[PDB]
Write a protein that binds this DNA or RNA. Structure first.
Ligand SMILES: [Mg+2]
Ligand SMILES: [Mg+2]
Ligand SMILES: [Mg+2]
Ligand SMILES: [Mg+2]
Ligand SMILES: [Mg+2]
Ligand SMILES: [Mg+2]
Ligand SMILES: [Mg+2]
Ligand SMILES: [Mg+2]
Ligand SMILES: [Mg+2]
Ligand SMILES: [Mg+2]
Ligand SMILES: [Mg+2]
Ligand SMILES: [Mg+2]
Ligand SMILES: [Mg+2]
Ligand SMILES: [Mg+2]
Ligand SMILES: [Mg+2]
Ligand SMILES: [Mg+2]
Ligand SMILES: [Mg+2]
Ligand SMILES: [Mg+2]
Ligand SMILES: [Mg+2]
Ligand SMILES: [Mg+2]
Lengths: 399, 62, 59, 95
RNA sequence: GCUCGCCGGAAGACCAAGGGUUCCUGUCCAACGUUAAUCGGGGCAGGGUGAGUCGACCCCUAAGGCGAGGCCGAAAGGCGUAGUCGAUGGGAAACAGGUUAAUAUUCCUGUACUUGGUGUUACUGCGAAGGGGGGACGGAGAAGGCUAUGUUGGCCGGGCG
């Protein structure tokens, strides 16, 4: 960070999420400001506070991106389905640079029209055609600005752009709720025993996540090399350090977009009793929701991690460099081995993740205390810390 | 050690020997699986055992 | 189909345990390392958000 | 058999493709055990320490290869590999 | 990969022996290979040999060896009794199918068998280093009954070029 190279990337990201938080306050019609500021006090539907985390306080206060970049991810999965079932997209996806980036531009162009459609869904069902029109216009202007803004953070900014968009979007929604808690902390209105029990549980859960990350699962690999220069004499044991979750950053945001999609389509109408059947089903006070949610998390984590690594490329690499897993045949069998093993790991990873998601709600149902601490946002925050500290160390090895 | 062990009775010493042997087994078991980062422990236990035995003998020898 | 899904999940649970045996047991030193590292990073992000939004909400 | 002797009998769990295949297909573990250990002693040790019920024990003795470290010719040590078959209900612990 | 040619009572499949990792996979090409080598029975690294029924061990002896005492001999030693060793011989029991890059009558699937130990139940005179039977034995010849096996026909799949 003391190097201007990464420092300007970070001061690009900071500014990007600062105009994210500038666009987060801009009213949907021309000036509805006070009217909306009344409607965002939730005369109905408290859980909409979750919808204000990913949008940077859009459903909290009056913005141009209402769901934020959540439409994009809802497209990012859709095309990713269409790439699988439809062969014609499966050919363009394997096509290298322009072929993969044309699919990403079709994901961007499906995204913007999905923001049009969801602005149609809101401004038809929930709020009310002049208001409807100003709604659709401000919402597509915001989703477009933010989509550009998050493809700029991937390039001239730090790390992955969309990741940091959502991560800092939820990170920047916290301070008022805790400001009120620490103002009531010099009084004692809400007892300090429950709040310090949750204060120690956030910290010990994050600690357990990062302790399960501390001790790894390492596959011992061996190198036998003596260089022909008669100098280097080498028998080397190198661990391949498998982590319980492989970049658990993105499938978290993905799974969250797939939670909030039926909550957008079903709950904005309410005149549909089936839609409200499933959006009440999908309210996270119920075991049914957590079942559908579990299947979602495991499917998206398995699919995404299976996407990331190519165990045949990794094994062939290991073979090229003159490395072997002792006792296992180089080539295909190393592939099958590391793949089966990585599967057996990542499944456990997505499992303990679905548990960090589910448990806080049963804890809040049993206990008197009733969104940031509900298990989704706790996890995404643990992942902001993990992501930033892994990306800092990767370039601290460089610097 | 070895002063501390001389202050123990014979029964206690046998129990001690069993404990040491169990630690030895577990240790080389972890070492074979490549799960043992600290190798030095082996030499520590293996030697401690000897100590115990040398005591047992000397107590049954006098 | 459901009994084969059952036996499959039982096999995947055997795999689970197999990967639990390679899981490292409690250590208090790495506990304090993790603890203080994450406490520090969280304190940094919190001081950023507070230094900004405290003076922003105040105005 | 005395528990002192048992503890010195099992050297190490063996890894390989064939070991893997064995463990998955036949519910069988493969151990590297003492040169002088017997099918009896091995059965006893695995039933004692890993708290599992054993069906049957097969054994073989691998002869050592002949290797050269910096032109010096050594001859590696023979060792006894034991295939151990657990009862089908038994589950596999690694400790 | 497609043609062509050779062996086929062997230039084929499998054992004992003698060797001892040459077996299998990866990788390497200096040396080794009567040439080249990207290949190897070469270098380097990792694997691989699973038995109550196969063999050895074991019980029993042949030739022959050793041999308590013993006889004989300058000394060393030589011979030999009781004994005890010695297979190339006698002595209990497993087959078909599946499977590995590499083992399988050894693993697995199925269906068996043997000899001991212990327990129940019924019946009952048991007991050796001794006694008797058996084990237990040549050459040639013949032809009667068979199977291994093969050919035709029937059947079944496929083919009308
Ligand atoms: Mg068997
Ligand atoms: Mg054997
Ligand atoms: Mg040696
Ligand atoms: Mg001829
Ligand atoms: Mg060689
Ligand atoms: Mg070969
Ligand atoms: Mg050349
Ligand atoms: Mg040459
Ligand atoms: Mg070779
Ligand atoms: Mg036999
Ligand atoms: Mg004789
Ligand atoms: Mg004499
Ligand atoms: Mg004589
Ligand atoms: Mg004899
Ligand atoms: Mg013979
Ligand atoms: Mg015989
Ligand atoms: Mg073969
Ligand atoms: Mg007789
Ligand atoms: Mg005759
Ligand atoms: Mg016939």
């Amino acid at each position: 960070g003391g190097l201007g190279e990464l420092k300007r990337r970070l001061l690009f990201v900071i500014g990007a999420l600062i105009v994210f938080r500038i666009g987060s306050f801009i009213p949907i019609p021309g000036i509805d400001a006070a009217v909306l500021a009344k409607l965002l006090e939730q005369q109905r539907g408290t859980i909409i506070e979750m919808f204000n985390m990913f949008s940077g306080g859009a459903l909290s206060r009056a913005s141009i991106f209402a769901l934020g970049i959540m439409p994009y991810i809802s497209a990012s999965i859709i095309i990713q389905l269409l790439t699988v079932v439809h062969p014609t997209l499966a050919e363009i996806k394997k096509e290298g640079e322009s072929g993969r980036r044309k699919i990403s531009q079709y994901t961007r162009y499906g995204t913007l029209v999905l923001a049009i459609f969801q602005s149609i869904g809101i401004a038809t069902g929930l709020p009310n055609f002049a208001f409807y029109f100003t709604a659709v216009v401000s919402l597509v202007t915001g989703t477009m600005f933010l989509m550009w803004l998050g493809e700029q953070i991937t390039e001239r900014g730090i790390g992955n752009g969309i990741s940091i968009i959502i991560f800092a979007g939820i990170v920047a929604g916290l301070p008022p709720a805790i400001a009120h808690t620490i103002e009531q902390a010099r009084q004692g209105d809400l007892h300090f025993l429950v709040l310090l029990l949750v204060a120690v549980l956030v910290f010990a859960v994050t600690f357990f996540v990062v302790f399960v990350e501390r001790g790894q699962r390492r596959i011992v690999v061996n190198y036998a090399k003596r260089q022909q220069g008669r100098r280097v004499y080498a028998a080397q044991s190198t661990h391949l350090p498998l982590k319980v979750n492989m970049a658990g950053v993105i499938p978290a945001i993905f799974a969250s977009s797939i939670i909030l999609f039926p909550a957008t389509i079903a709950s904005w109408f309410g005149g549909w009793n089936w839609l409200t059947t499933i959006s009440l089903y999908l309210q996270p006070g119920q075991p049914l929701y957590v079942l559908l949610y579990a299947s979602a998390i495991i499917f998206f984590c398995f699919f995404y991690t299976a996407l990331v690594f190519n165990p045949r490329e990794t094994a062939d690499n290991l073979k090229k460099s003159g490395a072997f897993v002792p006792g296992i045949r180089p080539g295909e069998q190393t592939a099958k081995y590391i793949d089966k093993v990585m599967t057996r790991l990542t499944l456990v990873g997505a499992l303990y993740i679905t548990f960090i998601c589910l448990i806080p709600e049963f804890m809040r149902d049993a206990m008197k205390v009733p969104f940031y601490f509900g298990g989704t946002s706790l996890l995404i925050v643990v992942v902001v810390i993990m992501d930033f500290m892994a990306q800092v160390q990767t370039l601290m090895m460089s610097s | 050690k070895a002063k501390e062990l001389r202050e123990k009775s014979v029964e206690e010493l046998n129990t001690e020997l069993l404990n040491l042997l169990r630690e030895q087994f577990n240790l080389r078991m972890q070492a074979a699986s490549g799960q043992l980062q600290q190798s030095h422990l082996l030499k520590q236990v293996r030697r401690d055992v000897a100590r115990v035995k040398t005591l047992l003998n000397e107590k049954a020898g006098a | 189909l459901l009994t084969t899904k059952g036996k499959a999940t039982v096999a995947f649970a055997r795999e689970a345990r197999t990967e639990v045996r390679k899981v490292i047991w409690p250590t208090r030193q790495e506990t304090l390392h993790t603890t203080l590292i994450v406490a520090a990073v969280t304190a940094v992000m919190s001081l950023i958000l507070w230094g900004l939004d405290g003076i922003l909400v105040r105005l | 058999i005395r528990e002192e002797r048992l503890l010195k009998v099992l050297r190490a769990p063996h890894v390989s493709e064939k070991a893997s295949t064995a463990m998955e297909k036949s519910n069988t573990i493969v151990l590297k055990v003492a040169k002088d250990a017997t099918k009896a002693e091995i059965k006893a040790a695995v039933q004692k320490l890993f708290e599992v019920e054993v069906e049957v024990v097969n054994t073989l003795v691998v002869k050592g290869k002949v290797k050269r470290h910096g032109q010096r010719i050594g001859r590696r040590s023979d060792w006894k590999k034991a295939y151990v078959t657990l009862k089908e209900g038994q589950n596999l612990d690694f400790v």
